[PDB]
């Protein structure tokens, strides 16, 4: 029935990255008879012509599932290609509001936990600093909630403003005693943003930043420890539970040396997302093999550019195999709804104020925010 070796493709951005090392380590953990052979391709996540050329080359080669990253430029094209050709895609990148069920998003949504956290602290007037190349769905939700609840939001783009604009914003904020800031961007850009904040601007009295991301301990905030500077971050991956600690210990004591040079010293949560993606792919294919369903290629895939689309028949079943996967990984429970996005996740809200790392509660889809 199912062949022992099956090919999967990868749209990785850079070979010299922690995500590649996590991918290789997670693929090395496979001991089941279903084996995932990897075809990785390294391109910039931009210039959609090159990326659809890579996608068409992988489809002509005959891959089953594709694991990769996308940005705002290539999200629509990848989503349309996967929804039309019925090719299963699994990504750890940001989730979008509109997508077909044949693409799987591993990053949990932060559009509702942020609103609940803002509602917890009784915020009315604040400045929201967002990244343009990240997705404006969260900004849209924040603006809609502000319009409904009569809030004051000062929306600031990172790339649009300059240092003088930052000084004008901060001198306007200092005139009011209760100044409040929300920021949201990737941690690599957020590090430079926070360095800008500490470089000349006071990070002392007031200034309750709410870091809207998935990794709180990822960001080096030791300079934020000077005075005040209360910060409320979200965490998805806990390096204390038995299973994440066991897997991290196995990563520490690995017989095969990983790629790159160093993949530690505050490791990224996207590596955990890549590990979970490999794990869900392996579990889905194992469960599909257990059900005794034929998935053998009846001929050749051909080319993307054909006047009749003619999707492969069992591919929807492949998507079904990607839907009922459920276990516990580094990020916790991995469950998907009908739309194909991750659901029923627990987010640990960690707020620190001049003392240290301390968890104040958690967030669940059904229970909203439960303080602890």
């Amino acid at each position, epitope marked *: 029935n199912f062949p022992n070796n099956i090919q999967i493709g990868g749209l990785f951005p850079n070979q010299q990255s922690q995500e590649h090392a996590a991918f290789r380590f997670a693929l090395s953990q496979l001991t089941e008879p279903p084996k995932l052979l990897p075809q990785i391709d390294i391109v910039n996540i931009s210039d959609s012509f090159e990326m659809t050329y890579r996608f068409c080359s992988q489809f002509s080669k005959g891959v089953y599932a594709i694991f990769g990253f996308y940005e705002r430029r290539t999200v629509n094209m990848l989503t349309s290609f996967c929804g039309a050709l019925h090719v299963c895609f699994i990504t750890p990148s940001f989730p979008v509001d509109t997508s077909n069920q044949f693409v799987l998003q591993l990053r949990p949504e932060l559009q509702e936990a942020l609103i609940s956290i803002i509602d917890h602290y009784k915020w009315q007037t604040f400045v929201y600093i967002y990244d343009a190349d990240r997705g404006l769905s969260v900004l849209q939700r924040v603006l809609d909630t502000a319009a409904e609840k009569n809030w004051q939001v000062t929306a600031v783009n990172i790339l649009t403003t300059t240092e003088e604009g930052y000084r004008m914003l901060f001198q306007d904020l200092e005139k009011k005693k209760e100044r409040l800031v929300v920021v949201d961007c990737e941690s690599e850009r957020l590090n430079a943003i926070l360095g800008q904040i500490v470089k000349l601007e006071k990070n002392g009295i007031g200034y309750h930043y709410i870091l809207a991301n998935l990794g709180f301990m990822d960001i080096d905030l030791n300079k934020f420890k000077e005075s005040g500077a209360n910060v409320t971050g979200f965490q998805l991956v806990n390096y204390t539970d038995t299973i994440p600690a066991r897997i991290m*210990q196995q990563w*520490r*004591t690995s017989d*095969s*040396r990983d*790629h790159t*040079r160093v993949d*530690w010293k505050r490791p990224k949560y996207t590596s955990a997302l890549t590990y979970d993606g490999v794990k869900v792919m392996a579990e889905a294919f194992q469960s599909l093999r257990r059900q005794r369903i034929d998935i053998s290629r009846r001929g050749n895939a051909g080319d993307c550019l054909a006047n009749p689309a003619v999707p492969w028949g069992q591919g929807i079943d492949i998507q079904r195999a990607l839907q009922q996967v459920r276990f516990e990984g580094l990020t916790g429970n991995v469950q998907f709804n009908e739309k194909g996005r991750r659901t029923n996740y627990t987010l640990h809200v960690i707020e620190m104020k001049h003392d240290g790392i301390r968890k104040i509660g958690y967030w669940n889809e059904d229970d909203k925010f439960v303080p602890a």
Partner: single-chain antibody
Amino acid sequence: EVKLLESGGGLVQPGGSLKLSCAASGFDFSEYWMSWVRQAPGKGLEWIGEINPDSSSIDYTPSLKDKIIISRDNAKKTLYLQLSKVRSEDTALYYCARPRGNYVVMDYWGQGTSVTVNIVLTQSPASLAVSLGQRATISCRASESVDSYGSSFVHWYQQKPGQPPKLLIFLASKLESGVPARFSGSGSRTDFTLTIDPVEADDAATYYCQQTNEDPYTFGGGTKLEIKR
């Protein structure tokens, strides 16, 4: 830069159990695993044993595994190796070392102590002596693959007689931290090559090349370097 203390090298009785106290000051074995190695006088170093970062499974020596047992505490950050049926040849220099893969600064071996009770690489030239301000190239030919898992997997460590060893270059992509040595692996490196520019009086030590691609990482004959006056 992590700090490792290893003192108390002295003579012992015939057949008695010896103990070497290795202290990982300012750090713990939880973050990085600690490994002890054994080196004889005028001979290459051999791995006496390895531990785990979680202190769950501890490995032993490839030559005499059951003869020596090493117990380490990560919270106390203290390691002690005991032995049974100790002979004259069994009294070798035992030196601890933190994990080199954690960081280049964390790649700081212990001081090492001696008591009186692999990698096949040829490094040339064996004798080196140049004045301060000169550049020298040393080639370490090996039998295994020049590069393992994309990049190279060979290392060079400069150890002096009576002084603690220091890893100069590791995996041809991360040299020694703290003091950046100019000698590092570069190019295709069919033989492990490192261009030192410039050498100094403190760099008068023997540089041993160990192929980390070939299991296990053991220092070979190496090449000796000095400073000409």
